[PDB]
Design a protein around this ligand. Sequence first.
Ligand SMILES: [Zn+2]
Length: 65
Amino acid sequence: MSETITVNCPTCGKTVVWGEISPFRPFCSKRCQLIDLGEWAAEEKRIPSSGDLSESDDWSEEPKQ
Ligand SMILES: [Zn+2]
């Protein structure tokens, strides 16, 4: 209703209705729009836990720490 164009999700490939009718006009899901940018990894925001054995592989880990 009132502008109802369908946009295809560029992350998974799905026809999602855009305009004034559905709650998620942009992308089919929140995760699809997220991965679309490319700044979301298994971690939330940086990894505070570091050390132990082979934990947090980001820079200079080594088998000693
Ligand atoms: Zn999608």
